[PDB]
Design a protein around this ligand. Structure first.
Ligand SMILES: *[B@]([O])([C]N1[C]=C(C2=[C]S[C]=[C]2)N=N1)OP([O])([O])=O
Length: 354
């Protein structure tokens, strides 16, 4: 038990000197006990320490909240995953994108959506026009290409289905249901002093810029204690209201496989125990940047683990949990470090406990 601080100090702390990272928060949850380790500074210029109030940008870990919101809407009957976006976004009815179902948008298999929108797309009108003018390339449902606009559109449709803007879906419904007290799409005036600076590869202070459908794709900010509560909810959904319990369980169901990686809703899913290289290969150039033909799930793993990475220009995130061991880990940094280093450090810590 005294083990956990020592393991995090051994495996995470050296990454600060190695990549010149100003600040880091590492959390472990084991048998419903939380451990919070804080290193360095939230702000270099203000000499302000990382602490339990420090707000970090989650980047792509935001996609897990979008997935949870989708699972909540589905199990309340507001949407079906067999529906197409035109059923909710009326101006997309009978357009080519209206042949793609909500699951295919959520799990990046439209067959023609890249990582980013084109830089030129900024306004609400430019976003609509982009989806109106969309045409298929690969057969729909057959090719995974990891995509912000794909899950972004899924998020916008989930919001329309609940008759609230996406920011209010998370801040008024999903975050309260999960018992999160300091998680935001928009950080309010009263919390700006707790919002860390991110640092770019020149160690210049930076925060995420507004972008098209940013909120559902990479737009959430949170604290270490909130993210440990979120991992707690994913490990122990029974303790939570029926609505959010079903939502969470919906995010754990694998939909297809790309070799050893199973794509669930937001979460990446693996057979446990997974080899280090299985976890590293999940975020290789091949999987993250290029199209990959999917297979149906053949081996449905009895014992599963889940992870997700997140990056903004100034922040790095990693979350992993293993239901069978009742254990999980959160890493938040205010400078990006390679995905490899995040996954490897978490692997050694979680394999040395129990
Ligand atoms: B998500 O946050 C996807 N992602 C990364 C970026 C980016 C990093 S630096 C400039 C832009 N934009 N969207 O993280 P990932 O799944 O790649 O870990």
């Amino acid at each position: 038990d005294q083990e956990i601080k020592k393991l995090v100090d051994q495996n995470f702390k050296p990454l600060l000197e190695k990549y010149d990272v100003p600040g880091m928060a590492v959390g472990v949850i084991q048998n419903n006990k939380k451990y919070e380790m804080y290193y360095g500074l939230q702000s270099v210029q203000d000499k302000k320490a990382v602490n339990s109030n420090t707000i970090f940008e989650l980047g792509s870990v935001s996609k897990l909240f979008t997935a949870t919101a989708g699972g909540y809407a589905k199990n309340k009957g507001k949407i079906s995953f067999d529906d197409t976006p035109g059923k909710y976004w009326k101006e997309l009815k009978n357009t080519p994108i209206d042949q793609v179902n909500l699951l295919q948008l959520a799990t990046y298999t439209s067959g023609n959506l890249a990582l980013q929108f084109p830089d030129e797309v900024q306004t609400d009108q430019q976003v609509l026009t982009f989806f109106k003018d969309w045409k298929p390339k690969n057969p729909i449902g057959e090719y995974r290409q990891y995509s912000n606009p794909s899950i972004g559109l899924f998020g916008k449709v989930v919001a329309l289905s609940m008759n609230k803007p996406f920011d209010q879906v998370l801040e008024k419904t999903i975050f309260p249901a999960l018992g999160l007290k300091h998680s935001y799409v928009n950080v309010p005036k009263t919390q700006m002093q707790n919002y860390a600076f991110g640092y770019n590869q020149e160690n210049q202070p930076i925060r995420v810029n507004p972008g098209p459908l940013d909120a559902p794709a990479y737009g959430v900010k949170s604290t270490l204690p909130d993210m440990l509560s979120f991992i707690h909810a994913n490990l122990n959904p029974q303790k939570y209201p029926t609505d959010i319990q079903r939502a969470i369980n919906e995010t754990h169901q694998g939909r297809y496989q790309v070799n050893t990686m199973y794509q669930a809703l937001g979460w990446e899913e693996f057979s446990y125990p997974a080899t280090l290289q299985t976890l590293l290969d999940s975020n290789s150039e091949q999987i993250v940047m290029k199209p990959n033909k999917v297979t149906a799930i053949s081996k449905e793993p009895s014992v599963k683990m889940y992870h997700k990475t997140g990056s903004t220009s100034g922040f790095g995130t990693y979350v992993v949990f293993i239901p069978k061991e009742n254990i999980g880990l959160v890493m938040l940094t205010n400078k990006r470090i390679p995905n490899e280093e995040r996954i490897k450090a978490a692997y050694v810590v979680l394999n040395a406990i129990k």
